[PDB]
């Protein structure tokens, strides 16, 4: 599994790929080359979930019915779908939350700036899901990872106390995907895409 | 009075100049070169208020004790301070409203993006006052109108229905100063300075 997706077409592929959600998942912590994993099967496919970030310590005893946001890294030689983090807690509570999204496309001297909205539907959300769904919104609605759009940052205002900065030029660091944010605490998101 | 400040040091002068607020001001609408004005004196200085935007219709019957945000356009030979718009409602209730302020500073390939807040203290606020205090905040803490910082935009999300876009490259258009915003409906502000 590759951390660093260089090439604009690889980024587009990854952040365009379909993602999934699954509720009430359980699994003991097996290992896999030091990397903690958890094997489960929602229906018709074995998954193995890598716990690398804050989630590694957090779920040292395994998963007892949590929510899991799944993005496909690869299919290993046994047919297991490898995904990393995305583990929110054991009963995210359907909460309609529209948080302001600003997208600013800087092309040389031209600044194209628009207002928008980001839809969260749960009490808390993994940084993996924010990162993925935001970028998927940007790729789909704003031409991210097409043409000269690739570099830039996603800044998130968390309760006016912390800035969560995400670099657009590469895939989100794997060890950050364990992070979990309170949905109601997200005051807003401002994206800026620095066109080459 | 001059609409267009082209040089960076004029823009710095204007948006660094001290502003003033006055409550309970009344005054009949007079005439001055085809412009509708209202003359008043809070204490020691005659003022000459210009109603050029939406506020020209709104206050056709003069001011009956409204609030007025004052920025000094100039002192004419008679000692009268000329100011433009900035008129909000009477009994503008005091009310804290911190609204997310994002500032992103693009310098070629570098993006310097930070989270901030913007302080409003009323149910209503003129665009003149948003524009002014936002820019004064950018002047004071983000080096606006000093280095190469001049161009770029302010983006205000208004109830998710309208984007109010302001160009940092010039002084705000005089006709927009009469505009009024509902403080609680401002979802956030995203500034992007394009260091060029």
Automatic annotation (TrEMBL), chains A, B:
It comes from the Bacteria. Transmembrane segments: none annotated. Residues 105-192 form the Staphylococcal/Streptococcal toxin beta-grasp domain. One of its GO terms (cellular component) is extracellular region. Residues 10-91 form the Staphylococcal superantigen-like OB-fold domain. Belongs to the staphylococcal/streptococcal toxin family. This is Exotoxin 1. It comes from Staphylococcus aureus. The gene is set1.
